[PDB]
């Protein structure tokens, strides 16, 4: 299947309180593998997965020095954007970036991207051609014209097609993905008068992607069902539940279905008093 190498970058100004806080986080297949945090006396790029200590001290010095350079460029960028938007020097602001390459099963580049946001809104994005830019407002247009006139898209296309895929191709290459199957159970809770709540739980699963449904007579109860957003247990696994309110005494007419990539086939379960 496909693989991804992506970096998520945050720069937050804190006028009067010190230097901006800068973070870079690297993900292989949506799993954190390296992190740089500026909030230290001697900030270093650090491994975050069990396989990254293989890299020598040469790797860590180069990446640390790269991240420190990026940090200082985003410090400048934060100041630049105050000019572009005519904002005062007293407020905190945030720049974010997502940058990366996704390759198919065949090792060919599927998608490369470089997307910037300012204070929670899209700012500029490199287009799929890896040759042109989409600007979100008239401020970002200024950056666009600067980058068109500096061969930035050229420098990016060479990174995304070249070094990104090369590093990705070798990173965790170990190519296949962990799955932990959900364990499921149903709980029973009282409601006012002649109704009860049935809650179908899925616990201990990985990855987060999952679907829970409740069926009455073969049909999924989309309208009446309450769902929580999937949430981490804190140990690497995830949790989710779905509930329905049903008539007292009709609990055995309802079936929970759990769908997860780890399961040989979906779980079906009912309230078991």
């Amino acid at each position: 299947g496909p693989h991804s190498l992506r970096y998520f970058v945050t720069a937050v100004s804190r006028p009067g309180l010190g230097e901006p806080r800068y973070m870079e986080v690297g993900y292989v297949d949506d799993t954190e593998f390296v992190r740089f945090d500026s909030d230290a006396e001697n900030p270093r790029y650090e491994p975050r997965a069990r396989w990254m200590e293989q890299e020598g001290p040469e790797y860590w010095e180069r990446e640390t020095q790269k991240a420190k350079g990026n940090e200082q460029s985003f410090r400048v960028d934060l100041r630049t954007l105050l000019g572009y938007y005519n904002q005062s020097k007293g407020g905190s602001h945030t720049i974010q970036v997502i940058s990366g390459c996704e390759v198919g099963s065949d090792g060919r580049l599927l998608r490369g991207y470089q997307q910037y946001a300012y204070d929670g809104c899209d700012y500029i994005a490199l287009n799929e051609d890896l040759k042109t830019w989409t600007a979100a407002d008239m401020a970002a247009l200024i950056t666009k014209h600067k980058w068109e006139q500096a061969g930035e898209a050229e420098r990016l296309r060479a990174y995304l097609e070249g070094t990104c895929v090369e590093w990705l191709r070798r990173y965790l290459k170990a190519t296949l993905l962990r799955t932990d199957s959900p364990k499921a159970h149903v709980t029973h809770h009282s409601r006012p008068e002649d109704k009860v709540t049935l809650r179908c739980w899925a616990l201990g699963f990985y990855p987060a992607d999952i679907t829970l449904t409740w069926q009455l007579n073969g049909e999924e109860l989309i309208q009446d069902m309450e769902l929580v957003e999937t949430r981490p247990a804190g140990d690497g696994t995830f949790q989710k539940w779905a509930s329905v309110v049903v008539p007292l005494g009709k609990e055995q007419y309802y079936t929970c279905h759990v769908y997860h990539q780890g399961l040989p086939e979906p779980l079906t379960l009912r309230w078991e008093p």
């Binding site: 945030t94 974010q96 929670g120 809104c121």
Partner: protein
């Protein structure tokens, strides 16, 4: 820019059993700006040793983080997570419900 209001869930790592040590989570998502203050409370009083995960953000730019603390639930103790963030006029408190 924008402000996004944090979404909060308070829940245990393991199914709760009275008297058995466990971990209480406060999972806070979908917020912007990234500055946030998260407290966990037992019977109304701040819990001292609350650990914070590293902060991350999603494809929609919004931030998320997990706060957690050791706890030993009992039948009558009350737990809550309180979050202060510029998107909200007052701090939001969400109580732990052992059934959710």
């Amino acid at each position: 820019g924008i402000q996004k209001t944090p979404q909060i869930q308070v829940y245990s790592r393991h199914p709760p059993e009275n008297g058995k040590p466990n971990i209480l989570n406060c999972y806070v998502t979908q917020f912007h700006p990234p500055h946030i203050e998260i407290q966990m409370l037992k019977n109304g009083k701040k819990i001292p040793k609350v650990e914070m995960s590293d902060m991350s953000f999603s494809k929609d730019w919004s931030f998320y983080i997990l706060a957690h603390t050791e706890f030993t639930p009992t039948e009558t103790d009350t737990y809550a997570c309180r979050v202060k963030h510029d998107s909200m006029a007052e701090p939001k408190t969400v109580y732990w419900d052992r059934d959710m």
